[PDB]
């Protein structure tokens, strides 16, 4: 019996300060070796009902600290049907996506929780959580 597996790997030496759009902060993976037509990944931190791939994270030390990121990857499309997250149509057992800075930002020193959930086309195997640390 095959299970859908997820992993999430975060970069490591991030400096608080000016951050450019496109800077990769984390990479995610989804795995499912059963029969499927694609993968869907979304997050509860999605910014607004009209931005399926854009997330807004709040700081642990100060919730007023925000960082805005987007889900990205070759082949991933915004899920316009559900309006939540990104969709990739593939029979491949493995898929991967990036979480990147969305818009030039002044990121303060704090820690942010990055959560995402994945579906093969949620239990404790379909979701993952990491902390993103920006230091001064």
């Amino acid at each position: 019996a095959e299970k859908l597996q997820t992993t999430l790997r975060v970069g490591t030496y991030f400096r608080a300060g000016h951050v450019p759009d496109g800077m990769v902060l984390a990479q995610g993976w989804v795995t499912y070796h059963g029969s499927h037509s694609g993968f869907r990944v979304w997050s509860d931190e999605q910014k607004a009902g009209n931005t399926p791939t854009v997330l807004l994270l709040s700081g642990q030390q100060d919730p007023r600290h925000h960082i805005q990121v987007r889900l990205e990857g070759e082949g991933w499309q915004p899920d316009t049907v559900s309006g939540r997250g990104a969709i990739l149509r593939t029979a491949a057992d493995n898929a991967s996506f990036s979480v990147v800075v969305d818009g030039n930002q002044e990121v303060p020193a704090d820690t942010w929780t990055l959560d995402f959930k994945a579906c093969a086309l949620p239990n404790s195997e379909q979701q993952k959580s990491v902390d993103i640390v920006f230091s001064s």
Side-chain angles (χ1 to χ4, degrees), residues 13-121:
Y13 288 106
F14 301 130
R15 186 190 280 195
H18 288 96
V19 169
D21 172 281
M23 176 172 161
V24 179
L25 303 178
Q27 190 76 13
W29 282 264
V30 296
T31 292
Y32 181 68
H33 301 286
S35 39
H36 62 283
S37 71
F39 295 99
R40 181 187 170 246
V41 307
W42 72 103
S43 163
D44 287 333
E45 288 94 24
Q46 181 170 319
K47 183 181 161 156
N50 68 322
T51 65
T53 56
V54 178
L55 299 42
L56 188 65
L57 277 35
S58 288
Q60 294 170 12
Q61 289 156 31
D62 192 341
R64 294 159 66 248
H65 289 161
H66 296 301
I67 186 171
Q68 179 169 312
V69 303
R70 62 170 179 264
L71 312 171
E72 257 191 352
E74 190 181 354
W76 293 86
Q77 311 186 324
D79 186 359
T80 52
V81 176
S82 86
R84 295 296 303 258
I87 173 60
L88 170 72
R89 307 272 186 191
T90 177
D93 292 342
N94 296 277
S96 189
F97 65 89
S98 297
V99 181
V100 314
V101 173
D102 180 65
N104 298 339
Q105 286 162 70
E106 257 291 327
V107 178
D110 206 331
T111 297
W112 288 271
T113 294
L114 186 64
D115 286 320
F116 82 97
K117 305 127 198 87
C119 273
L121 294 327

